[PDB]
Swiss-Prot record:
This protein's name: Small ribosomal subunit protein uS2
Biological processes annotated in GO: translation
Source species taxonomy: Bacteria, Bacillati, Bacillota, Bacilli, Bacillales
Annotated PANTHER family: 30S RIBOSOMAL PROTEIN S2 PROKARYOTIC AND ORGANELLAR, SMALL RIBOSOMAL SUBUNIT PROTEIN US2M
Source organism superkingdom: Bacteria
A GO cellular component entry from the record: cytosolic small ribosomal subunit
Pfam families: Ribosomal_S2
Amino acid sequence: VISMKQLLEAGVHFGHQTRRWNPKMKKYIFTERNGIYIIDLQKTVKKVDEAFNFMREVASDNGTILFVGTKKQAQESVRDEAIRSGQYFVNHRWLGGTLTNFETIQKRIQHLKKIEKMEADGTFEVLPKKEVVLLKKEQEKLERFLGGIKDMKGLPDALFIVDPRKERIAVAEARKLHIPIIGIVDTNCDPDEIDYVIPANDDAIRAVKLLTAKMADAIIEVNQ
RNA sequence: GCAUGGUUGUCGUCAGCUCGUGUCGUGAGAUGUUGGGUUAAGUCCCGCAACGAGCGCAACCCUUGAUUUUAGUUGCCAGCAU
Ligand SMILES: [Mg+2]
Ligand SMILES: [Mg+2]
Ligand SMILES: [Mg+2]
Ligand SMILES: [Mg+2]
Ligand SMILES: [Mg+2]
Ligand SMILES: [Mg+2]
Ligand SMILES: [Mg+2]
Ligand SMILES: [Mg+2]
Ligand SMILES: [Mg+2]
């Protein structure tokens, strides 16, 4: 239920190129400007409503969602929305096998929390060099890749991606695992493998925040 | 010793040889173990559909180079003379 004035004032309608686009996205097209394709805003507001209603149904029983923002233009936007809405996200590289190999990756998560109590209850250092360096250097890398996904317990119930052309592993890893997928698609992205596509621009920083925070408002609406 | 246990040599103290769970391939198989740097070394980092681990490397062991305590003879001789 976003008015076109907000979408237009962000920069959502912009596209990538006339040379770099997916023919499957033809129906979500409105006029060719000077070298750029433009999304039909009338379609976007209709599309965003279905995703607006759907992702509170998945969160109707205090469910769980995932936010994928590895792109450099949406690292904080997913973090800002997930933290504010009390959910989960990923910002650094998507480690292959996060979902299909959830059994193995979870063993890595408990290892990072294992060292957490070392500086919380146990001895600060075991050796002057090994514990101070080898044990501590692991935490910086281990908590950079996993980070704010450590509080999950089981497989997610819905997935949020911003650029399915870049985040391809996540997409393929969710279809094999049969998880509903919602996300924003550019002019060169492929809508066939997504469930609840949202035609919009994602390179424009002022355009990502409009949708990513709006989606965060639907899940926050029912968990009360 | 071109039938064998053994016991050995040289490549070589070179840095390699693999496994589990995932993923790609109809399939034998592949990835991890390739790419950019770095190191004595798949040593270590960064980047990637991989995430980890085992035998190898390094470490544990012996000897030399500084030092504390302990025990002072058959070793040592400053304080004392002989
Ligand atoms: Mg023989
Ligand atoms: Mg002979
Ligand atoms: Mg020789
Ligand atoms: Mg197969
Ligand atoms: Mg090899
Ligand atoms: Mg060597
Ligand atoms: Mg050794
Ligand atoms: Mg020594
Ligand atoms: Mg002494």
